[PDB]
Amino acid sequence: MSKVCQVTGKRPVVGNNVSHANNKTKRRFEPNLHHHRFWLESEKRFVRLRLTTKGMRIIDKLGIEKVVADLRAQGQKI
Amino acid sequence: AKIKKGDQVIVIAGKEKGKQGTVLSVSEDRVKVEGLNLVKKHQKPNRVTGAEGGIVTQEASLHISNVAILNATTQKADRVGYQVIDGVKTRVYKSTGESVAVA
Amino acid sequence: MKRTFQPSELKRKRVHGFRARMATKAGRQVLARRRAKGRHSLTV
Amino acid sequence: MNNERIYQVLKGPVFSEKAQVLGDTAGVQVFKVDINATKLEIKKAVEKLFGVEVVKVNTTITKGKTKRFGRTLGRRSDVKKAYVTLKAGQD
Amino acid sequence: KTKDLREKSVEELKALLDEQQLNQFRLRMAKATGQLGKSHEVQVARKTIARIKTLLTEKQ
RNA sequence: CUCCGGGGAGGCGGCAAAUAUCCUUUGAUCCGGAGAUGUCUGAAUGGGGGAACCCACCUACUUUAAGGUAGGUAUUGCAACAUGAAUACAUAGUGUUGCAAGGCGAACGAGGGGAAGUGAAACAUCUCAGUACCCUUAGGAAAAGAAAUCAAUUGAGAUUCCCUCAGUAGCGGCGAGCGAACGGGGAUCAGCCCAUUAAGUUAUGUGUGUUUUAGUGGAACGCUCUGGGAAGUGCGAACGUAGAGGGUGAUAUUCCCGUACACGAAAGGGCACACAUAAUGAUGACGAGUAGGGCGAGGCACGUGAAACCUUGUCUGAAUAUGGGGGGACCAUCCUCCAAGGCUAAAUACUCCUGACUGACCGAUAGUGAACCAGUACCGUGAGGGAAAGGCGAAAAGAACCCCU
RNA sequence: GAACCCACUGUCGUUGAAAAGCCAGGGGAUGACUUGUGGAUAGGGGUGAAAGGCUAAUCAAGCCUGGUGAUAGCUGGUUCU
RNA sequence: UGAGAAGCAUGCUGGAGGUAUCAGAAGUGCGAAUGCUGACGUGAGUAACGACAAAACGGGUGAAAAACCCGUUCGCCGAAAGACCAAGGGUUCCAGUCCAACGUUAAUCGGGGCUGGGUGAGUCGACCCCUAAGGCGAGGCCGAAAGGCGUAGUCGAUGGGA
């Protein structure tokens, strides 16, 4: 129901385009979001997460089980 | 102070000043005294109840501040105070302190 | 000649009625403004 | 149909030329009744409180009049009338 | 008459309520026909019904 | 409607008089507290719907006919229990019960988005301005808060608000404009913890104190003149811990209501302090995808500038007390602090509302749009716009009766 | 060629009977036809057998409320001796 | 009376407030702004009285009759100027009584004022069962928020059902 990373909470942010004549117009920066299936061995199933590449790096560093447990602690249905 | 329906009062202001009588009613701050402050009412006939009309004389109310309770002993205007004689509140004449004569 | 107002009670109620106003947040804001102003009749 | 509602169904008789003619000729009673009363309720109330037999009931509702009194406008309430037909010669 | 009413049972009070409701209907019919000169009668019946219902609520 | 308390002779609310039936010293009307009842619509929640309507289902009792009485039946979230696919174990799914939430409403707070008219005597950087407006969501306040902060004699010592510093230093088509800090003087003052866990806060109960919701008593003036009427003239008198105010037929300390002062509460509510028990603080144990860096933006008085510092959309990425951050490019030396975990009162902001008091504020074209049956009449499909209209007399004593019509 | 749907000509009307009409003539009238009821498309948008036409008697950017007391080197006015 | 803005005295009306002097503060002075609100003039007793289907007389009532009632004639419509239904309106329907205002004149008349009556259903219509276009929409998909769309369903006649 939004462009929100499940792991980091990243979401689009506002900013400006700045031309060579210094004209400023509003823009947004969007996160590098995508869907990814991760094998969960303790539950014998694939979990599909909407996350950023930075969230993927976090999962790489901390293990899928710890991240999933943390999201469940924050109150997400995984 | 207090003036009730049965009392005997004396008029202290208005065209009836000096006259005395018995009050007939008290309502809000207006009092009617028997035989005082008479007006002439031109009454039209009341068709449904007959009652052929005429010029009738009746009493008009005076402001309660324009009458004073009459002291029977001295035949003079007085004021009214309150005293708990024995265990009951009663009215008393300010000038003398005796109780107020009942109607 | 035909004039602009051609009355129809069903269309009147379905366009400007109480439930139509309550169905959206802007209509509820309309009702709030009319209550704040103290209108004797809120809707058609 | 309880006694409390039975005692509330009927309001009063109707006094008019039409009601008087109906009573004098066709043996029909004209009543003012509760705005929410039904035909079954009216029949039960009449049979209980008058000891007569009812063959059929006709009802009609007259909307109240809006009139201006003084400087203010007002409206009278709706009235429901019951035409109660009694069996053979009764009441 | 609430003091007199309070010295009765629930079952007596319910019968009293039924009697008073029937009496109220009879008074309304008499007034509608125009045979009644005293409307304080219907006022008293109304207030008595209210008192009986209050006492029933208190006692139950 | 009931009960408790007050009060003591009238009363059946107002326009709005009259009339009847009446009620009341066996204590009415009225005033305060506590209870009972409380139709339908509306978050509206049994389903639906053009708001105030249409149609239902399930239990228990009741009736004999075609009904009644009472209770239950919304959605979502959490917990427990039960049941249960592809698919073997499971999981998803399904149901019941219990608890909770939704809506409305002034301003103030916090956060998510965010203009243009205008000024620059044109206009694009800039200004207007993080203003107007839209959205989400608290509390009696909120936010912030206990230095990886400043300072530069080696000193200060958490936040917040006010006066100065100062229109100074700076920023800026170096234009128009924007505009600090250090230091000093005040208001208020307060610190406490990271798993055996603190200060504090919130509930319930008890006790104490105070306050609040009816009320009672409450001093003292006569004569005379003018007058329709005296409170006004003239002559004397009395009270004052009371000469605030209002009314009474014209201008009253002493006529009335009051005022100073002295008292007063069955019953209920508010606040303060002290104990009791819960619960919270409090999934957190010294902080890694973190600090720092490359690219693009935003915030800082500071527009890329000699540009430090803070935030991060994207790509990366340490050391870890012989360690690390800052002191406005940067290096060395000195000084100072310990980020990547938390809680915390006051001084501060506001007025839909309650009580008391006040005004060199208005007096019916003024003052609220509205002193009056006004957000009404009226206009518009609708959002919406939006008036005019106060005064007989002290008292109706509001003109019996006669005449023309 | 009637009903029905249109609007080519002329007189009248122009503080009208009428904020677009009457009268006398005129065109289509089984079709790309006329029409009731109920719906959909919303403002730099819609719809348009295309005239910048129409979008509630308003259209080269509808109406209402706010920014707002916009700005106006322009015009007017500015009260006793 | 003074040089002026103005001052002073007094007759009549009016019926309860006014205020020296010296200081102090301003919603402090109007003829104009095609200024704003209310009242009232001129035009002027002038134009007009809304389809050129058309009226005449006798009697009645009445303060008053061209317009109301009764009667005898005349004329106009008759694919509507007659009779119905839906939509829309809401008491305008009927009777008695009244004539100020309303009715483009008067009115005894009225769709006007006041008072009292009047709408009777198993078969007519609605409600109800059913669905179209379209609307809403448990879960769901999407979106900074507000929200967009949509499945199962659930509504919705202008149509089907004694």
Ligand SMILES: NCCC[C@H](N)CC(=O)NCCC[C@H](N)CC(=O)NCCC[C@H](N)CC(=O)N[C@@H]1[C@H](O)[C@@H](OC(N)=O)[C@@H](CO)O[C@H]1NC1=N[C@@H]2C(=O)NC[C@@H](O)[C@H]2N1
């Ligand atoms: N979604 C965004 C998409 C981005 C897209 N990829 C475009 C892109 O990649 N980069 C955009 C640039 C972003 C930057 N913040 C804009 C900025 O800082 N401007 C500065 C403007 C200064 C002043 N106000 C006017 C001025 O003097 N201007 C000049 C010049 O007029 C302009 O000439 C045009 N204009 O005609 C250009 C020559 O061409 O040089 C400008 N001067 C300069 N230019 C340089 C620059 O940018 N940096 C380094 C330095 O050299 C800069 N000085």
